[PDB]
Write an enzyme that holds these catalytic residues in place. Sequence first.
Site, PDB file in Angstrom:
ATOM      1  N   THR A  83       0.802  -1.221   0.000  1.00  0.00           N
ATOM      2  CA  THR A  83       0.000   0.000   0.000  1.00  0.00           C
ATOM      3  C   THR A  83       0.832   1.268   0.000  1.00  0.00           C
ATOM      4  O   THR A  83       1.753   1.413   0.795  1.00  0.00           O
ATOM      5  CB  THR A  83      -1.117  -0.014   1.057  1.00  0.00           C
ATOM      6  OG1 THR A  83      -1.862   1.208   0.948  1.00  0.00           O
ATOM      7  CG2 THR A  83      -0.595  -0.203   2.497  1.00  0.00           C
ATOM      8  N   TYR A 174      -9.431  14.996  -4.831  1.00  0.00           N
ATOM      9  CA  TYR A 174      -8.648  14.434  -5.937  1.00  0.00           C
ATOM     10  C   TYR A 174      -7.967  15.569  -6.764  1.00  0.00           C
ATOM     11  O   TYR A 174      -6.774  15.507  -7.048  1.00  0.00           O
ATOM     12  CB  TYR A 174      -9.591  13.577  -6.791  1.00  0.00           C
ATOM     13  CG  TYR A 174      -9.013  13.109  -8.106  1.00  0.00           C
ATOM     14  CD1 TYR A 174      -8.283  11.927  -8.188  1.00  0.00           C
ATOM     15  CD2 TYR A 174      -9.242  13.822  -9.285  1.00  0.00           C
ATOM     16  CE1 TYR A 174      -7.789  11.470  -9.400  1.00  0.00           C
ATOM     17  CE2 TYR A 174      -8.705  13.396 -10.498  1.00  0.00           C
ATOM     18  CZ  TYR A 174      -8.001  12.207 -10.553  1.00  0.00           C
ATOM     19  OH  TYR A 174      -7.518  11.748 -11.750  1.00  0.00           O
ATOM     20  N   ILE A 209     -10.610   8.616 -19.327  1.00  0.00           N
ATOM     21  CA  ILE A 209     -10.043   7.414 -19.944  1.00  0.00           C
ATOM     22  C   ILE A 209     -10.935   6.228 -19.616  1.00  0.00           C
ATOM     23  O   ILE A 209     -11.346   6.066 -18.464  1.00  0.00           O
ATOM     24  CB  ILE A 209      -8.561   7.196 -19.492  1.00  0.00           C
ATOM     25  CG1 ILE A 209      -7.723   8.527 -19.450  1.00  0.00           C
ATOM     26  CG2 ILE A 209      -7.880   6.099 -20.327  1.00  0.00           C
ATOM     27  CD1 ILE A 209      -7.497   9.254 -20.784  1.00  0.00           C
TER      28      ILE A 209
HETATM   29  N1  LIG Z   1      -9.315   6.893 -15.732  1.00  0.00           N
HETATM   30  C1  LIG Z   1      -9.517   8.194 -16.011  1.00  0.00           C
HETATM   31  O1  LIG Z   1     -10.572   8.621 -16.566  1.00  0.00           O
HETATM   32  C2  LIG Z   1      -8.441   9.165 -15.639  1.00  0.00           C
HETATM   33  C3  LIG Z   1      -8.583  10.525 -15.918  1.00  0.00           C
HETATM   34  C4  LIG Z   1      -7.587  11.424 -15.555  1.00  0.00           C
HETATM   35  C5  LIG Z   1      -6.447  10.966 -14.890  1.00  0.00           C
HETATM   36  N2  LIG Z   1      -6.299   9.655 -14.616  1.00  0.00           N
HETATM   37  C6  LIG Z   1      -5.081   9.164 -13.854  1.00  0.00           C
HETATM   38  O2  LIG Z   1      -4.658   7.938 -14.380  1.00  0.00           O
HETATM   39  C7  LIG Z   1      -3.955   7.194 -13.363  1.00  0.00           C
HETATM   40  C8  LIG Z   1      -4.393   5.749 -13.406  1.00  0.00           C
HETATM   41  O3  LIG Z   1      -5.825   5.716 -13.228  1.00  0.00           O
HETATM   42  P1  LIG Z   1      -6.747   4.520 -13.734  1.00  0.00           P
HETATM   43  O4  LIG Z   1      -8.100   4.996 -14.101  1.00  0.00           O
HETATM   44  O5  LIG Z   1      -5.988   3.703 -14.708  1.00  0.00           O
HETATM   45  O6  LIG Z   1      -6.877   3.759 -12.332  1.00  0.00           O
HETATM   46  P2  LIG Z   1      -7.258   2.274 -11.866  1.00  0.00           P
HETATM   47  O7  LIG Z   1      -7.595   1.450 -13.051  1.00  0.00           O
HETATM   48  O8  LIG Z   1      -8.426   2.370 -10.908  1.00  0.00           O
HETATM   49  O9  LIG Z   1      -6.009   1.677 -11.113  1.00  0.00           O
HETATM   50  C9  LIG Z   1      -5.400   2.348  -9.975  1.00  0.00           C
HETATM   51  C10 LIG Z   1      -4.222   1.491  -9.572  1.00  0.00           C
HETATM   52  O10 LIG Z   1      -3.655   1.936  -8.317  1.00  0.00           O
HETATM   53  C11 LIG Z   1      -3.653   0.861  -7.393  1.00  0.00           C
HETATM   54  N3  LIG Z   1      -3.870   1.382  -6.045  1.00  0.00           N
HETATM   55  C12 LIG Z   1      -5.058   1.761  -5.473  1.00  0.00           C
HETATM   56  N4  LIG Z   1      -4.956   2.111  -4.214  1.00  0.00           N
HETATM   57  C13 LIG Z   1      -3.608   1.933  -3.930  1.00  0.00           C
HETATM   58  C14 LIG Z   1      -2.870   2.014  -2.728  1.00  0.00           C
HETATM   59  N5  LIG Z   1      -3.390   2.389  -1.551  1.00  0.00           N
HETATM   60  N6  LIG Z   1      -1.562   1.674  -2.771  1.00  0.00           N
HETATM   61  C15 LIG Z   1      -1.030   1.298  -3.939  1.00  0.00           C
HETATM   62  N7  LIG Z   1      -1.622   1.190  -5.131  1.00  0.00           N
HETATM   63  C16 LIG Z   1      -2.924   1.505  -5.055  1.00  0.00           C
HETATM   64  C17 LIG Z   1      -4.710  -0.120  -7.891  1.00  0.00           C
HETATM   65  O11 LIG Z   1      -4.478  -1.483  -7.474  1.00  0.00           O
HETATM   66  P3  LIG Z   1      -4.795  -2.205  -6.073  1.00  0.00           P
HETATM   67  O12 LIG Z   1      -6.202  -1.656  -5.640  1.00  0.00           O
HETATM   68  O13 LIG Z   1      -4.681  -3.693  -6.029  1.00  0.00           O
HETATM   69  O14 LIG Z   1      -3.875  -1.523  -5.132  1.00  0.00           O
HETATM   70  C18 LIG Z   1      -4.513   0.000  -9.398  1.00  0.00           C
HETATM   71  O15 LIG Z   1      -3.402  -0.784  -9.816  1.00  0.00           O
HETATM   72  C19 LIG Z   1      -4.218   7.939 -12.053  1.00  0.00           C
HETATM   73  O16 LIG Z   1      -3.077   8.709 -11.668  1.00  0.00           O
HETATM   74  C20 LIG Z   1      -5.456   8.768 -12.404  1.00  0.00           C
HETATM   75  O17 LIG Z   1      -5.611   9.955 -11.637  1.00  0.00           O
HETATM   76  C21 LIG Z   1      -7.293   8.728 -14.998  1.00  0.00           C
HETATM   77  O1  LIG Z   2     -10.363   7.318 -10.119  1.00  0.00           O
HETATM   78  C1  LIG Z   2     -11.202   8.342 -10.663  1.00  0.00           C
HETATM   79  C2  LIG Z   2     -11.818   9.381  -9.714  1.00  0.00           C
HETATM   80  C3  LIG Z   2     -12.004  10.614 -10.606  1.00  0.00           C
HETATM   81  C4  LIG Z   2     -11.431  10.211 -11.980  1.00  0.00           C
HETATM   82  C5  LIG Z   2     -11.018  11.414 -12.785  1.00  0.00           C
HETATM   83  N1  LIG Z   2      -9.774  11.766 -13.046  1.00  0.00           N
HETATM   84  N2  LIG Z   2      -9.837  12.999 -13.785  1.00  0.00           N
HETATM   85  C6  LIG Z   2     -11.109  13.294 -13.934  1.00  0.00           C
HETATM   86  C7  LIG Z   2     -11.767  14.420 -14.612  1.00  0.00           C
HETATM   87  O2  LIG Z   2     -10.948  15.329 -15.199  1.00  0.00           O
HETATM   88  C8  LIG Z   2     -11.398  16.219 -16.111  1.00  0.00           C
HETATM   89  C9  LIG Z   2     -11.440  17.581 -15.796  1.00  0.00           C
HETATM   90  C10 LIG Z   2     -11.907  18.472 -16.779  1.00  0.00           C
HETATM   91  C11 LIG Z   2     -12.332  17.999 -18.032  1.00  0.00           C
HETATM   92  C12 LIG Z   2     -12.286  16.636 -18.326  1.00  0.00           C
HETATM   93  C13 LIG Z   2     -11.806  15.746 -17.357  1.00  0.00           C
HETATM   94  F1  LIG Z   2     -11.749  14.418 -17.601  1.00  0.00           F
HETATM   95  C14 LIG Z   2     -13.113  14.513 -14.607  1.00  0.00           C
HETATM   96  C15 LIG Z   2     -13.903  13.448 -13.934  1.00  0.00           C
HETATM   97  C16 LIG Z   2     -13.257  12.425 -13.334  1.00  0.00           C
HETATM   98  N3  LIG Z   2     -11.874  12.342 -13.325  1.00  0.00           N
HETATM   99  C17 LIG Z   2     -12.369   9.207 -12.638  1.00  0.00           C
HETATM  100  C18 LIG Z   2     -12.244   7.958 -11.732  1.00  0.00           C
HETATM  101  C19 LIG Z   2     -10.298   9.318 -11.435  1.00  0.00           C
END
Ligand SMILES: NC(=O)c1ccc[n+]([C@@H]2O[C@H](COP(=O)([O-])OP(=O)(O)OC[C@H]3O[C@@H](n4cnc5c(N)ncnc54)[C@H](OP(=O)(O)O)[C@@H]3O)[C@@H](O)[C@H]2O)c1
Ligand SMILES: O[C@]12CC[C@](c3nnc4c(Oc5ccccc5F)cccn43)(CC1)C2
Lengths: 282, 266
Positions: A83, A174, A209
């Site tokens: 963690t 966040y 994403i």
């Molecule tokens: N998905 C989107 O729409 C989106 C948008 C903007 C930015 N992002 C950024 O993209 C990155 C990846 O996001 P994702 O959507 O691909 O996430 P995800 O699929 O939910 O995966 C998050 C990862 O972090 C691990 N994790 C969770 N809690 C943890 C802890 N306490 N210690 C260590 N590891 C931990 C999870 O595995 P375990 O639970 O087994 O630990 C998993 O491997 C993040 O930095 C997120 O902010 C994503």
């Molecule tokens: O683990 C998660 C918790 C929030 C999460 C997450 N990470 N970034 C975002 C976001 O950014 C945005 C901000 C402005 C425009 C478009 C976006 F996309 C908008 C809505 C959710 N976003 C989706 C699931 C990351």
Amino acid sequence: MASMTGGQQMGRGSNEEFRPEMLQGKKVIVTGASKGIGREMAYHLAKMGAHVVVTARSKETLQKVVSHCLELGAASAHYIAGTMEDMTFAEQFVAQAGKLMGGLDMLILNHITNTSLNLFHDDIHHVRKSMEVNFLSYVVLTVAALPMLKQSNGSIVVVSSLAGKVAYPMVAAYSASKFALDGFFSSIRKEYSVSRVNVSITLCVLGLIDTETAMKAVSGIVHMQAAPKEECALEIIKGGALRQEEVYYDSSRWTTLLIRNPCRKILEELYSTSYNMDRFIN
Amino acid sequence: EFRPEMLQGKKVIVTGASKGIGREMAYHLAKMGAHVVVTARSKETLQKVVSHCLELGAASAHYIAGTMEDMTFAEQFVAQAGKLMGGLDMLILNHITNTSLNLFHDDIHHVRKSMEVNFLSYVVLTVAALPMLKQSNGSIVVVSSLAGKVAYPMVAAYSASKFALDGFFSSIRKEYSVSRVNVSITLCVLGLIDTETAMKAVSGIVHMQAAPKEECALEIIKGGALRQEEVYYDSSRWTTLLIRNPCRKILEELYSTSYNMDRFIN
Ligand SMILES: NC(=O)c1ccc[n+]([C@@H]2O[C@H](COP(=O)([O-])OP(=O)(O)OC[C@H]3O[C@@H](n4cnc5c(N)ncnc54)[C@H](OP(=O)(O)O)[C@@H]3O)[C@@H](O)[C@H]2O)c1
Ligand SMILES: O[C@]12CC[C@](c3nnc4c(Oc5ccccc5F)cccn43)(CC1)C2
Ligand SMILES: NC(=O)c1ccc[n+]([C@@H]2O[C@H](COP(=O)([O-])OP(=O)(O)OC[C@H]3O[C@@H](n4cnc5c(N)ncnc54)[C@H](OP(=O)(O)O)[C@@H]3O)[C@@H](O)[C@H]2O)c1
Ligand SMILES: O[C@]12CC[C@](c3nnc4c(Oc5ccccc5F)cccn43)(CC1)C2
């Protein structure tokens, strides 16, 4: 043959036309790599022939990623489960990952604490956990990784969000943690520049994403077009390999046209003459 | 257009008010005839500020001493400040943990303390103050820095905490707008200010012109009274020409057409 081989991938144009061969034999850490974007990054690096060390809490899901990385063509693949709430684990993980690979070329900071969309009312525990996991652990991981990265002239890749550049409702804690990443990493980047610390810092600003957790979290509330995780993961890697300061990846062409802040770039250039850092670097 | 009468009889909290900008804000509010509750760790220096506030013409002036490292103190302080005044109109969040200019190496304790004091306590203070501010259709004033909008070396932990304030408070401002919470949020983006602690901290390192603390304090109060989203105060005219991010405002508007919050607020 490797003993009789030498040279460099990074010649004319490597700033900036990406080739998968830039990652061949590179020693890479990927956090939050059991699922989503992190897992996709591990897979791309595997295909590129990089040495990979993946982390997350689930050893069973990490085992599956490692096994598939080896199948894809990774030079080596390992996992260490734990963690990122535990700062001692974060610190020891880097020493253990570096020992497994014999060094470190790229540190990919991707993990976050589990977050759902909700209005902020009184959940201080979530604001603190968000700051600890999404921000403070990235700093602890960077401190532990820096000596190895200095040795290899490596790279730090910080995964952020559009919510780390603009305000977005329902993700206040966040967003605060993602904005903190920008302030911290962009400030140390200026420090590294003057200190001659040849470690690049890539801030990746991602829109929505199509990961399983994001699609579930935003279902019925956020109706925007989601971008593919596979291409997202590649764009992050490319950015880090090319030593780019910032990466922008989103479904909207209007985002790409507007996110850049040329005024911030100009101001930072103007303010770079306001200080005398000689006492800190000699 | 601001008028000093906008603060007459207003119930105001000022944190980090024993010195610098915070003390200057307490003095302006006292002259305007506001009810004032000041905080910082030093009861002796707070006593001097309160006494001077009463001399300047404050409707009432009190202090409560304590550390903003203690989240329980932050929470109890608001309840007590509100009990002294019979409510709250404006919450001025100004305090920061003691910070010197240095390159970031391995001081994780300073990064955490910066986040706890400069950011987390502001959130705790806001949670404790919100019911009273909702009752008065009040204001939250968040004191930030140019280092909370742009990157600056030697202040990495501090910059991280100031950037966090923008992300947090600008996100809840959108939430308040849709939730019909009539509590304004003013983010104050300050350049270098001639406070005793800043002048000592930056001596021989930073040579840019420092702006006066008295005028800085007034501009913060004005911004809150006018319910402005952001206040910009700096010596340089090139800062004023460049800090604003109209593209961020446009993007936020473009992205608001993409979400539906009427499930959280009905
Ligand atoms: N998905 C989107 O729409 C989106 C948008 C903007 C930015 N992002 C950024 O993209 C990155 C990846 O996001 P994702 O959507 O691909 O996430 P995800 O699929 O939910 O995966 C998050 C990862 O972090 C691990 N994790 C969770 N809690 C943890 C802890 N306490 N210690 C260590 N590891 C931990 C999870 O595995 P375990 O639970 O087994 O630990 C998993 O491997 C993040 O930095 C997120 O902010 C994503
Ligand atoms: O683990 C998660 C918790 C929030 C999460 C997450 N990470 N970034 C975002 C976001 O950014 C945005 C901000 C402005 C425009 C478009 C976006 F996309 C908008 C809505 C959710 N976003 C989706 C699931 C990351
Ligand atoms: N001065 C500048 O150049 C500058 C530039 C940009 C932005 N700002 C912002 O302006 C605001 C005020 O700055 P300033 O220069 O006026 O600072 P200052 O003169 O040094 O005063 C800081 C105040 O916070 C209090 N404080 C410190 N540690 C505390 C703790 N643990 N708990 C509670 N209170 C604590 C101090 O009192 P005690 O020690 O007695 O507690 C003091 O009243 C800050 O938010 C700062 O970021 C200043
Ligand atoms: O308590 C203190 C610890 C740091 C402090 C402090 N607060 N804001 C700043 C700053 O922002 C700036 C960023 C860019 C341009 C101009 C600035 F001004 C630059 C340098 C120091 N800054 C000076 C003394 C606050």
